[PDB]
Ligand binder design. Sequence first.
Ligand SMILES: [Zn+2]
Ligand SMILES: [Zn+2]
Lengths: 336, 87, 298
Amino acid sequence: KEEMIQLYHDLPGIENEYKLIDKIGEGTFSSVYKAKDITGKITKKFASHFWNYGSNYVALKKIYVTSSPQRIYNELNLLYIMTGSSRVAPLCDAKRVRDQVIAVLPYYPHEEFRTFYRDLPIKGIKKYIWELLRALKFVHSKGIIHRDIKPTNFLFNLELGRGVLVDFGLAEAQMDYKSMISSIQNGKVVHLNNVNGVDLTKGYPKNETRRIKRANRAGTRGFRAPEVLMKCGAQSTKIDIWSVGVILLSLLGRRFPMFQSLDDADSLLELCTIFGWKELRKCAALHGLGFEASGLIWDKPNGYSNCFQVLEQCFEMDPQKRSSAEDLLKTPFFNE
Amino acid sequence: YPHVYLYDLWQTWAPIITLEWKPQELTNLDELPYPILKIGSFGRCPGYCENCRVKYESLEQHIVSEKHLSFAENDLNFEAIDSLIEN
Amino acid sequence: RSGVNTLDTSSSSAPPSEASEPLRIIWGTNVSIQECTTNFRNFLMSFKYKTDEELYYIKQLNEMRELGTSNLNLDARNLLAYKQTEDLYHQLLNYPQEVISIMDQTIKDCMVSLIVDNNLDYDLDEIETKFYKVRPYNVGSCKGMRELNPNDIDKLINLKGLVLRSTPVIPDMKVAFFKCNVCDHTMAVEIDRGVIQEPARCERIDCNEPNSMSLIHNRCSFADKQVIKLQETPDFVPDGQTPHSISLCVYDELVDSCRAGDRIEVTGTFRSIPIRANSRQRVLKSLYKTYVDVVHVK
Ligand SMILES: [Zn+2]
Ligand SMILES: [Zn+2]
């Protein structure tokens, strides 16, 4: 109600361009409204889009002014160039003013994902993963890593079976090129092994982890890959498929609060709780950086199992085992 | 007492701290708190402006700031999308 | 939104107190570390001289990094312009000791954020390891050294005068070096508020002899210290008042920066200290001795 008037006051153009229908959602990164997109609006400009290939309702994405121009521009350009088909959201236009901006992204009817999360047959989940993993393969063909994979990031509609990606601001690319032209008491260091107390004994010695490593850590907690959790300086592609595996573990388990973690160390402790800290230390070591979990309490091997086996055996955290998207597609999911 | 820390095989790279005791409050021995997930834990009883690199508490306050106003009238970064839109 | 590494002085000043809704209010003071650092960062990132339109301090930091300088001269008057620092001004005047370290840490973190957020170059280890310092130089007007009261100790003030004498460089110990006269095991001890804790036992498990630690004088690490004799020239002079000369203490890089006959303006901290009655005993005199610690010289 107040939304139409305030948006008209800020942007008089939309008052004549569109009559805003109503608001359909509020994101932590932007706002989403639904508008009746029938002005002249050439159907060619609004054609070849995942919805019905015509001219009809277009959601308006109000982007918060706080976001950086470079970030918003990368998003609005990867909408335009690298996403125009293959079950992806296309963008046709955008309205800009001195400060604030809106994107014009065709509306896709959907429903809340918490409604059908425990009363849906297996075949529906099969086709859901089919659609998601096809979109993932197209994204990797484009060469970008989504890096922010969560249920809201992919809108779905069961009535029409529609599925489209959204809330993907954290999409970025791999290095895409690698160049190798050539090739007793001393202090608090005594704490356990030397390495435990090297940090304390000296005055904030060095600072590499957050200064010269500084890696990348963006996304949602509880969906990160072990390499990201360990803050490694090199990750190639498999974070997305690890997140997909987390999603399928969530869907095989009928319980709404899958993870309550909100910290990196807490998430790592959760991963050690679910899977043996022995193999966690093995993976951390083989990644190229050390690991030491001396926590006495809660060290016994974790319950591993106490369709399920085949779905649970596809969680391999090192880059020498796991396969590609079509490889996961090859498993039977397409009965008739 | 027990604890956890990740580090570097060479230690040239600074480590990651997870000093944790399930009995934090006494840091000796206790049972009430827990750092790990509980299978049943529903709860049942049984901003920052990167455009102006300044902290704030309410959006409207930051708008009236002189720095924020100065950028608004400055229109030189809008060529990017306009170039693609016209294409 | 930036990286941070704590300093030894910050850790030492860590011990907080309650009764402040932010928590972390240093006992005896009213300073709060979080608010002070946040206000300093905001002021640093947004301030123009009102050439009066450009970001005044962002450039200064840029040239500082480019040239390799480690000292930032801060006009204390500027803080009264910006609305946030209207209280940080009085906090800096009243509690310089903690505030200076807070600003220094904030400046180092600001430099790191500036270099990293723009992806200029990957050689950041040198700046990450080196030190920084901030020097106030435009404290408010004072009324002459005679007019300060005992309650003005450990405050920030400025003086004007004429230099007369300067004592030669005095070595000042910082790290003592002990040896065990039965196993050759050597230890190092860091001074703490002017007291060195001599070991009472060799820490080796094999060697545990009591009172076997001796001090090797040449193996210690020393600092630089100098004392200057200044003939002040206050602006306002009461009736029948004659001069004297004041003692100033200069440390580290400022030694040998003044020559007798120079006319200077100094900004420093007002101090006090008791003096031993005689070398033989260890009795002290009730009446204290005053001097100044130099933090900036113009
Ligand atoms: Zn702003
Ligand atoms: Zn010995």
